[PDB]
Ligand binder design. Structure first.
Ligand SMILES: C=C(C)[C@H]1CN[C@H](C(=O)O)[C@H]1CC(=O)O
Ligand SMILES: [Cl-]
Ligand SMILES: [Cl-]
Ligand SMILES: [K+]
Ligand SMILES: [K+]
Length: 254
């Protein structure tokens, strides 16, 4: 039947503008892990799509008392059929949209420059000399905002009090860790990609929690179950592990 509308956002190495001399248009403009996954799902399920970058360039957060923005809002409003992106599956977003079963699992951890030998978030929580933060209005910020763990409660207090500590996006966050005394609270799979390519960066400690990335849909979407079955089939054959290795494999560090 009709082409589905796919909403997404630029983010390495999930979704990128591929390199070309020509001016690209339509779906051809895109490559990455999420594009490979989307192609595999479209082939398996027999659907076509038109990819659209979400206008406001956000994932989705509950800004107002109630109202959503970003890809989540796009899904709430049925402006897109699918959100294909590293969209973190959270019980709070589940109050507004549905997800497929997760195609990738991960957790929050810390990105930091190699130097002052901290080894945990606790080390970060009990000082202020090293500024730390998260991407504003993202899953990670939301995790801290609503935590009951005292260590993270203290971190939220600092992060929220000083707005100059939250960043607009990953590129701004990574650049800050590279040019200032700044630790970034970031999802582990991105950290893994980054530390492989930036040998002076490292992950501090291990994973704080567990979560996954899933394909977002409007609640009660007829494609949600089909997409889930297909994702689970790919997983049984270790295809998603292979796909990740394809986009993640770096050149390696000293
Ligand atoms: C702003 C990015 C890159 C996204 C990706 N996953 C989280 C989300 O789905 O909101 C965000 C990262 C984070 O908040 O650690
Ligand atoms: Cl577009
Ligand atoms: Cl897999
Ligand atoms: K070009
Ligand atoms: K079609």
């Amino acid at each position: 039947n009709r082409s589905l509308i796919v909403t997404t956002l630029l983010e390495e190495p999930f979704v990128m503008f591929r390199k070309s001399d020509r001016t690209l248009y339509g779906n051809d403009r895109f490559e990455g892990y999420c594009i490979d996954l989307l192609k595999e799902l479209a082939h398996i399920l027999g659907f076509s799509y038109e990819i659209r970058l979400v206008e406001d360039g956000k994932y989705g957060a509950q800004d107002d008392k109630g109202q959503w923005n970003g890809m989540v809002k796009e899904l709430i409003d049925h402006k897109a059929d699918l959100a294909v992106a590293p969209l973190t599956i959270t019980h709070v977003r589940e109050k507004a949209i549905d997800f497929s079963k997760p195609f990738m699992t991960l957790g929050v951890s810390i990105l930091y420059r190699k130097g002052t030998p901290i080894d945990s978030a606790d080390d970060l929580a009990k000082q202020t000399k090293i500024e730390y933060g998260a991407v504003k209005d993202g899953a990670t910020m939301t995790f801290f905002k609503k935590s009951k763990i005292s260590t993270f409660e203290k971190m939220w207090a600092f992060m929220s009090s000083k707005p100059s500590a939250l960043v607009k996006n990953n590129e701004e966050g990574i650049q800050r860790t590279l040019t200032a005394d700044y630790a970034l609270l970031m999802e582990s799979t991105t950290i893994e990609y980054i530390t492989q390519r930036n040998c002076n960066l490292t992950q501090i400690g291990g994973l704080i929690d567990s979560k996954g990335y899933g394909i977002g849909t409007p609640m009660g979407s007829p494609y949600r179950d089909k997409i889930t079955i297909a994702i689970l089939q790919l997983q049984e054959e270790d295809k998603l592990h292979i796909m990740k290795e394809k986009w993640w494999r770096g050149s390696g560090c000293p």
